[PDB]
Structure 1
Amino acid sequence: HWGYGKHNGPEHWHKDFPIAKGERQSPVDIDTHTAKYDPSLKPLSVSYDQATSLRILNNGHAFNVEFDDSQDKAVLKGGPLDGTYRLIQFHFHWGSLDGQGSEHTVDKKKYAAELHLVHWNTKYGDFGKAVQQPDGLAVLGIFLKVGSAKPGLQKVVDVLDSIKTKGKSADFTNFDPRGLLPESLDYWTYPGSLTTPPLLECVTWIVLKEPISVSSEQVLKFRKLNFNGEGEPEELMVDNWRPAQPLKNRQIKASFK
């Protein structure tokens, strides 16, 4: 099955998921000079005060921090969005080295990692129905650079030892995702897709301009995770990013001048 290796990585995905070569695939390079400022774009509303994290899972591709999405608790609205989108999970993509790992790029710059906070449009009732719709998901993407530690990330980092291998989970309650946000909510936005199989073209992407800083030690701990299951040959969970895809007939809009 699909993964990030030589034999099952991004350049193979199209064989099982032909939408891989579609018209609105993600990620993309954000050409900052070509992105147009859109004065009609609203400030993003990130309302995470009542967020209820439940669990952290190593799914063999990344780790997901999962949230209770059975009520309007942690929601994303405004910005380019119409209606209310509920937080279901977050995860990261990262590299084997600090010079790569992000999925989106900014004028071809790769960041060390990229955080995806995944939300679904409440008008579709559940996540599985939402992914079948062109406006079903809103993914908030946040770049990570290596520098000072992110204190709000440390709780995540410290639990990774308990979910080293594929299919392991751990209780992960009371985690506040507000601690993963940068100061500014300036963003770029464009219509795109899931960046892993099934690659569904259901996402409004909202990518923050300002990266967060994490420490070298924090990202090193991401790189100790395993793609493999327990008692299988150790394959370090690194380079779990899809490269930039063709922009085709799309415009990237900026919320800021």
Structure 2
Amino acid sequence: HWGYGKHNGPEHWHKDFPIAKGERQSPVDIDTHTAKYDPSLKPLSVSYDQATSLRILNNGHSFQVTFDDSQDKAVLKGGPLDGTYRLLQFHFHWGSLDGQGSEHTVDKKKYAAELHLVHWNTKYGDVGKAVQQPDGLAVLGIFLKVGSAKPGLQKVVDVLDSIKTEGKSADFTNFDPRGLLPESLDYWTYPGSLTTPPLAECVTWIVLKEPISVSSEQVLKFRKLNFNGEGEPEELMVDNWRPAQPLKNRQIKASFK
């Protein structure tokens, strides 16, 4: 199946998913000088107070924390969005070394990692239906740089040893994703896609300008995961990022002057 290696990585994905060469693919490079401040954009509303985390899992391409999305608990609204989008899961992309790992780039700068908080539009009733709509999903993207530890990330780091290989999962209740957010909600936004197969063009991207810092030890633990299932071994889970795709006929808008 698809992956990030030489024979199954991003340059191969178009064969099974022709939309890989489509008009609104993600990620992209964010050219900070070209992105235009849009005074009509609204503050982003990130309401995560009643989030209910369920599980943590290694899906063979990242690790992911899942949430109960059957009611409006943890929701994203405002900013570029019309309506309400429910948090279903978050996951990460990271590198083999600190100078790569992010999917979006900023003036071609790659960060060590990137956090994606994936939300779907309640007007479509479930995430499967939402991925079939141009405004079905909103993904909040947050850059990670290496420096001080992020305390809110540690609960995640400490259980990664239990989900080393594809297919493994664990209980992961009472996790508060507010602890993964930077101070500022200044953001860039543009219409794009899922960055993993099926690459559906269903995402409004909201990428925060301010990175969070994580420690060397925290990201080191990401790098011990495996793409492979137990017994297939082994493909170390590193460099699970899609590179920047052509911007084509799109404008990136900034929420800040």
TM-score range, shorter chain: over 0.9
The offset of 1:64, in angstroms, is: 1.0
Structure 1 gaps, min length 5:
none
The offset of 1:100, in angstroms, is: 0.0
For residues 11 and 180 of structure 1, the distance between their equivalents in structure 2, rounded to whole angstroms, comes to 31
Q: Which residue of 2 aligns with 1:255?
A: 255
SS at match of 1:129: helix
- 1:211-246 deviations in whole A, cap 9, x for unaligned? 000000000000000000112222110000000000
For residues 162 and 231 of structure 2, the distance between their equivalents in structure 1, rounded to whole angstroms, comes to 15
Runs (4+) of structure 1 exceeding 4 A deviation are none
Q: Which residue of 2 aligns with 1:154?
A: 154
- 1:158-215 deviations in whole A, cap 9, x for unaligned? 0100000000000000000000000000000000000000000000000000000000
For residues 3 and 235 of structure 1, the distance between their equivalents in structure 2, rounded to whole angstroms, comes to 10
For residues 234 and 221 of structure 2, the distance between their equivalents in structure 1, rounded to whole angstroms, comes to 15
- 1:75-112 deviations in whole A, cap 9, x for unaligned? 00000000000000000000000000000000000000
The offset of 1:32, in angstroms, is: 0.0
Moved more, 228-237 or 215-224: 228-237
- 1:97-147 deviations in whole A, cap 9, x for unaligned? 000000000000000000000000000000000000000000000000000
Q: TM-score, normalised by structure 2?
A: 1.00
- 1:40-80 deviations in whole A, cap 9, x for unaligned? 00000000000000000100000110000010000000000
For residues 214 and 61 of structure 2, the distance between their equivalents in structure 1, rounded to whole angstroms, comes to 21
For residues 127 and 200 of structure 2, the distance between their equivalents in structure 1, rounded to whole angstroms, comes to 13
The offset of 1:12, in angstroms, is: 0.2
For residues 216 and 31 of structure 1, the distance between their equivalents in structure 2, rounded to whole angstroms, comes to 28
SS at match of 1:165: coil
SS at match of 1:155: helix
Q: Which residue of 1 aligns with 2:78?
A: 78
Calculate the aligned-residue CA RMSD, in Å: 0.3
For residues 38 and 212 of structure 1, the distance between their equivalents in structure 2, rounded to whole angstroms, comes to 24
Moved more, 232-241 or 114-123: 232-241
The offset of 1:31, in angstroms, is: 0.0
SS at match of 1:2: coil
The offset of 1:22, in angstroms, is: 0.1
For residues 167 and 82 of structure 2, the distance between their equivalents in structure 1, rounded to whole angstroms, comes to 35
For residues 79 and 176 of structure 1, the distance between their equivalents in structure 2, rounded to whole angstroms, comes to 22
Q: Which residue of 1 aligns with 2:106?
A: 106
For residues 116 and 216 of structure 1, the distance between their equivalents in structure 2, rounded to whole angstroms, comes to 20
For residues 98 and 62 of structure 2, the distance between their equivalents in structure 1, rounded to whole angstroms, comes to 17
Q: Which residue of 2 aligns with 1:182?
A: 182
For residues 234 and 26 of structure 2, the distance between their equivalents in structure 1, rounded to whole angstroms, comes to 29
